[PDB]
């Protein structure tokens, strides 16, 4: 039995978007302000005050569960995994940095200079 | 990565193998399929996928795709293929798709004719249900007040016929003459429904019944107050063949003219509507359920009877003595009661619309039938049926779908079917209009959040305006925007014959609503009314009133307890 | 809440059954709205406490005499109709004159 | 007088809260807008009294248990939303279950 | 009763179970449904079915079902959910219904789309196979005759550009300017099939695409002729976005601007169809199949090179000389084709078509292209690639319907998707136009018996017209009723985009032909092309041109013989 | 192996409409000339001149295969089985005999003249 509005939820955990690559990044808050980043926000067009690998971030959203954000305190040090956008993978906005295109490239990692 | 259905459950809502309970009932509904790759889903609030150049885009409306709205993930329950999770689209107060959202250019596969961009505006699927709105084929226009209740339990939609609380009107949904006609389709200029009118089937002559297909009637309505003669059914048929449009009989229940027999054979096999299928409303006394057998048909059935409770003998004693005015000191109009008060066809009734014979239901409001009350009596009878005759064979063996989706084509999609709108409105479908109910799983069947029309909100769940949310008490719903200056007549429907559409109605009566014309009403039958097939033999007893279907004796004991009623409403 | 219309209108009929009762406990004699008001009011009550449509039809006309109302009140009530939620739904309740 | 709309409106639930406590009186276990109704008028009148918007959450969270109503009642109620007017102006009354 | 299967063949056609061979191939097609109820099958005839009060009705064509024209039973060949035996219904020049046909009121089953009346006139589907005409992407307009040699092979649809037999219409498919457009458009009044004309797409400023778009045309055309850059590309492509219409490139094979790979980044992932996918045609030699393993691109492909024949080898050095007038004297142009007739890719390029990586098959008429052998070419390569490769892991144990229904979404509807008409054509489903094809399965892919074109037959195979019947030689094909007088134009279509159907093309160019704006050319990508979803990844030898897919060389042995050509045709 | 455009059909025969009643009557030809009654004619509204129990064909036709005709040469009688039409059961036209609907009456067959 099971309350009113309920779900008797079936015994298995959901899987992920699986055969995608995962680029793990140390991201710290170098401004004296919190930052918080969403699930589908597009990691190299962030502020320039967060300090890591920018050049690994091309075209990456984050690896976690869609809507929800994670918190990034000042001065706090924390590793998020990174996955590549689905479809074209065309991006546009955010900062006016690249508006478009992808980048890829099989072999070597070139284009787009910043 | 992975992570637990309970949380997924407290932010994205169900998916495959979830069972939801409809509120107090015994009944629970497992959704069939997820069409939606996982880890993309489509949600709107403050920092989630729904912004610039992540489930939105830069591309123009124009490009035919981009949606006016978004449900965000949603629980279905439509009867042609319900029970399902997905992104569902409007577009031009059309439904444009149904699957996923969101933006192709980032996220991999979004459906073509299901786009997020700068022209949408989200809804919150999650933890609620979707279906189409209803529909109800018997109502008599005694008050305009009436569609506000009706639209306050998910119905939004009405068929019938009348003047105002006028006797004629009261006890017949017939709206006489192109000059009431007229004026009627002209004063549904201020409701907030789709509304189809009904002219008087009553005739010798070609002529009266033209004049009325002409002014703009949906069909004909043939009455034991105004004659139920085998002429006047034949006259109402004939001319409903050539003009493509359905009849509603409420048969003589004096078997004056002839007995039910006499009646079938008037019809001469030609597709009708019968209201009160059980015989409480009316109908030849005492086999009328007898008409139920033959595939022509289309049976329909008031809510007053429905579900089968113990005090439900007592009650309607006195409510047939109002309706058909009849006196309780002459013997003749006493003793006509006796008969039509059996308690035996109630119950066969209960179960007819668990085997799928009784393809519909309708309400015969304030004449035997309550508006706002259609959805709820619906899944009233769901709860006895089930808790009584138990899983059926064609059920699946852990979930009550086939029952519900049984249940829901009775109110969504036969109603439409048999008054020629199923193109229209019927069923959650693409191509079709927005015309759709939202309610929480708790509230299933009873109370609705919103109300679509269109593609815009026409009735909804209202707190205090002039609060900071929507959700402060006193919670009353009122008309919303979709009710509101000269968008109520952009999203309503006076449905109207081709005849009358071809003439101009439009334009003659000056009708500043849509007009769509009723079509495909005489070519369908039973076997084309969805989840309701059936046609099985009938036996019945005129002595004791026993109903036998198929050499098996059709009743069952009633109900004290029904689900929802006292725990959610006041009154 | 969310609060349908019918369940809206039904507390403008309670708000003068507690006016009918005050008035009634200083001892004067009920008019059409009052009279109709504490009799219907009864219905409501009876299907909340779970009583059968037999029950409250003869506790309705129970309620009140001839003596509890003014002269003419009972000449222009020959019928009182009201529906209240049982407990398996809403139910008609007709009281063929109850003074 | 010069009711305001906000000020009409908020008649309407007061008179379900009489019903509330009257049904409470004779013993019965209240339903989804009885519960909500004398859940929102301890808030109405504790921002009548002048009690502070603490207080009036916590004390509605202490007027009813899950004996006191019917079976359901509190799986559908995680939250009980309301306005009333305080001594520094209207403001809002969040209950996060109070069953 | 009962009676075999062998006499119901004869009569009625095949049904579930049954396998029918295509020509002399290899390849056998199964039947996976049969939507009727054996009994009533409806067949027209002396003395059957088909009659007053059987078949046909008393009511009237505007009860909205009463087809126009039935097809009697016939094996549908669609990419959808084809291989299944159905009645077709034809009504105003689309598609009305697929399933079972004849008359409800005294048949059990009819489908309610599908009622056979007075207004019907059938044709023999049984012992046939009914499709979608084909449609042809690359279409140099240098002889408007080459129409008649394509629907001579069941191609109803026309994609490009061109003016007459001048050199710079010889090479490209480019109608441009507005004067020039205007005169095509007016010109293609007098052809037999739908039209969709290509400006040039090579331009540094928005204003001349501009010019195009609004003056009537269905997309542009990048070559390398007139100069495939990164900015003529770049360009094209931001006002294809704006106007929502698709590109075609014919990139530049001299590597002159930059690379492959260059050119890919001035796409910048925006969706962009691919001629000649395979090198032969052109494009960035060596590595141009490259492009294939990207979503954004649409694939499609010539037909010289397919099927990969041993002789294949010779004729091409030959054959580059005209096309793009290069001269067998000057080094720099004989030097520059040695890469161009590499034989590793064309090899490569007949797998692909089996793996489901080249979405789509064109042409390239008149210039590397035959317009006539295009179904028959597609069927020879299936033939090859079976004999060959064998049997798919996704294909089914017992029969090769889906490397056919593969095989036919690449001339059917994955063209129609690319130029954005798959809502008027493309598949043979419910709303869409009825542009369909009749072929025996003994002449499948060769030689069609009819061509249905807006619901009127406009090619079809006739023998003498003086005869007794239609059968008595000699049985040339000639244009029927469908392509004559003023019905040849209402049955075609000019495709135009939607800024130029705004502006009212078809009254200012004044065009009596039916005239349709192109969507959903843009948000598409390779998942939405039917049976060919696949974006594997590659790796090609710049020294040699050997192939690899997949860490795999993607080669095959050429084929001496191939299926249906010395045994059908003469010439 | 089959020829080209042959059908290689499956070793089962097919099953022509079952649960539908059958009515054997005796039919002969009296008149000079031959008659030939296809799959889906009402048998009831058919020539004078055939001899037979013309009440039995109540909205009947051929229980036969669709579109297959029987033949009938002057004189000769021969047994033929009937089934009842599909659908709604309302014929229209042959002979202005009936036009109408059958009805599947409650357990005799009456009802209209003849
Ligand atoms: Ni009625
Ligand atoms: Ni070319
Ligand atoms: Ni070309």
Not at chain 2, 261 to 285: K, S
Not at chain 2, 517 to 525: L, M
Not at chain 3, 24 to 36: F, I, S
Request: proline share 6%.
């Amino acid at each position: 039995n099971t309350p009113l509005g309920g779900c008797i939820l079936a015994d298995t955990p959901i899987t992920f978007n699986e055969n995608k690559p995962v680029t793990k990044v140390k991201v710290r808050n170098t401004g004296d302000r919190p930052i918080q980043v969403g699930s589908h926000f597009h990691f190299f067009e962030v502020n320039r005050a967060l300090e890591f690998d920018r050049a690994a971030a091309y075209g990456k959203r984050l690896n976690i569960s869609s809507t929800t954000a994670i918190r990034f305190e000042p001065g706090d040090e924390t590793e998020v995994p990174l996955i590549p956008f689905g479809g074209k993978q065309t991006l546009y906005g955010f900062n006016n940095l690249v508006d478009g295109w992808t980048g890829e490239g099989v072999v070597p990692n070139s284009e787009r200079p910043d | 990565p992975q992570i637990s259905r309970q949380e997924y459950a407290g932010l994205f809502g169900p998916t495959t193998g979830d069972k939801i309970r409809l509120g107090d009932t015994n009944l629970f509904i497992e959704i069939e399929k997820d069409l939606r790759g996982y880890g993309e889903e489509s949600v709107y609030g403050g920092g989630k996928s729904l912004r610039d150049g992540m489930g939105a885009n830069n591309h123009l409306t124009r490009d035919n795709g981009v949606l006016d709205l978004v449900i965000t993930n949603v629980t279905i329950v439509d009867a042609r293929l319900g029970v399902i999770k997905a992104d569902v689209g409007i577009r031009d107060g059309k439904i444009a798709g149904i699957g996923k959202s969101g933006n192709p250019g980032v996220m991999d596969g979004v459906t073509p004719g299901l786009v997020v961009g700068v022209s949408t505006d989200a809804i919150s699927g999650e933890h609620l249900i979707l279906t189409a709105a209803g529909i109800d084929t018997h109502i008599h226009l005694i008050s305009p007040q009436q569609a506000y209740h009706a639209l306050s339990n998910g119905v939004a939609t009405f068929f019938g016929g009348g003047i105002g609380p006028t006797d004629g009107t009261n006890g017949t949904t017939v709206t006489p003459g192109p000059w009431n006609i007229r004026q009627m389709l002209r004063s549904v200029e201020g409701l907030p429904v789709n509304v189809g009118i009904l002219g008087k089937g009553n005739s010798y002559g070609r002529g009266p019944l033209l004049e009325q297909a002409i002014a703009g009637v949906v069909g004909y309505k043939v009455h034991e107050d105004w004659g139920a003669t085998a002429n006047a059914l034949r006259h109402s048929l004939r001319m409903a063949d050539e003009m493509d449009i359905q009849v509603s009989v409420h048969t003589d229940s004096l078997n004056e003219c002839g007995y039910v027999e006499d009646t079938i054979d008037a019809f001469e096999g030609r597709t009708i509507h019968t209201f009160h299928t059980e015989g409480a409303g009316g109908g030849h006394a005492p086999d009328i359920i007898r008409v139920a057998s033959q595939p022509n048909v289309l049976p329909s059935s008031t809510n007053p009877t429905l579900p089968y409770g113990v005090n439900s003998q007592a009650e309607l004693f006195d409510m047939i003595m109002v309706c058909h005015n009849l006196n309780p000191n002459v013997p003749a109009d006493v003793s006509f009661a006796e008969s039509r008060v059996r308690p035996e066809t109630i119950a066969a009734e209960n179960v007819l619309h668990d085997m799928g014979v009784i393809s519909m239901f309708s309400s015969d409001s304030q004449a035997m039938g309550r508006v706002g009350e259609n959805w709820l009596r619906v899944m009233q009878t769901a709860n006895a049926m089930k808790a009584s005759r138990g899983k059926l064979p064609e059920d699946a063996p852990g979930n009550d779908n086939f029952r519900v989706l049984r249940y829901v084509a009775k109110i969504t999609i036969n109603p439409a079917i048999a008054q020629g709108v199923s193109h229209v409105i019927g069923s959650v479908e693409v191509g079709k209009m927005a015309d759709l109910v939202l309610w929480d799983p708790r509230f299933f069947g009873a109370k609705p959040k919103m109300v679509i029309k269109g593609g815009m909100i026409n009735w909804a769940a209202m707190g205090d305006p002039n609060a900071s949310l929507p959700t402060p008490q006193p919670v009353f719903y009122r008309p919303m925007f979709g009710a509101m200056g000269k968008t109520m007549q952009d999203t309503c429907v006076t449905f109207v014959s081709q005849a009358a559409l071809d003439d101009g109605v439009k334009e003659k009566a000056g009708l500043d609503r849509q007009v769509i014309a009723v079509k495909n009403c005489r070519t369908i039958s039973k076997h084309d009314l969805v989840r309701n097939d059936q046609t099985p033999n009938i036996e019945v007893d005129p002595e004791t009133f026993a109903v036998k279907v198929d050499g098996v004796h059709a009743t069952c004991e009633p109900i004290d307890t029904a689900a929802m009623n006292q725990r959610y409403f006041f009154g | 809440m969310q609060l349908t219309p019918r369940e809206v209108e039904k507390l403008m009929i309670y708000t003068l059954s507690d006016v009918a009762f005050k008035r009634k406990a200083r001892g004067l004699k009920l008019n059409y709205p009052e009279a109709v008001s504490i009799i219907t009011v009864t219905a409501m009550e009876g299907a909340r406490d779970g009583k059968s449509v037999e029950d409250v039809m003869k506790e309705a006309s129970k309620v009140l005499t001839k003596d509890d109302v003014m002269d003419g009140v009972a000449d222009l009530i020959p019928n009182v109709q009201v529906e209240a939620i049982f407990t398996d739904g809403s139910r008609l309740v007709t009281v063929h004159d109850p003074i």
